């Protein structure tokens, strides 16, 4: 594809955790490095909309692009710097919440079925916060 924000959004929607998926999209982004500003902006917006279990993969793409871009120029390293603090903060919180979801679901089952009383369920809930 030619570079466009629509093409990048579609490619990001399909980004998976495979080595090949990350590598392929990284190569395309480097081939269109003149558009590093828009690329990074779209990347950042789509990260935030992504399902919690796909968020780390966005940071892997960043890793790939930033590392592989060094031999071409400092554009991506510089562009990403403006958004990476927010990205890491966001993924840290989300991956935490995401990894606790099965535990919350279990407590919700326990409450629905009165496996224990509400006061004890609340104590368990608090112990994960």
């Amino acid at each position: 594809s030619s570079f466009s924000e629509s093409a990048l959004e579609k490619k990001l929607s399909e980004l998976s955790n495979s080595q090949h998926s990350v590598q392929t999209l990284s190569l395309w982004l480097i081939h269109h490095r003149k558009h590093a500003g828009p690329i990074v902006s779209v990347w950042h917006r789509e990260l935030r909309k992504a399902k919690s279990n796909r968020k780390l993969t966005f940071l892997y793409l960043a890793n790939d692009v930033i590392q592989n871009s060094k031999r071409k120029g400092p554009e991506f390293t510089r562009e990403f710097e403006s958004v990476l603090v927010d990205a890491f903060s966001h993924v840290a919180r989300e991956a935490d919440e995401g990894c606790k979801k099965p535990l919350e679901r279990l407590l919700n089952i326990w409450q629905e079925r009165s496996v224990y009383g509400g006061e004890f369920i609340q104590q368990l809930k608090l112990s994960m916060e």
């Binding site: 955790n17 495979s18 080595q19 090949h20 998926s21 990350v22 590598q23 993969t57 892997y60 890793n63 790939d64 590392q67 592989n68 060094k70 031999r71």
Partner: peptide, 12 residues
């Protein structure tokens, strides 16, 4: 396939 590894780029 292999899952992505972030040490895979050759940048040192």
């Amino acid at each position: 396939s292999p899952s992505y590894s972030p040490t895979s780029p050759s940048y040192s």
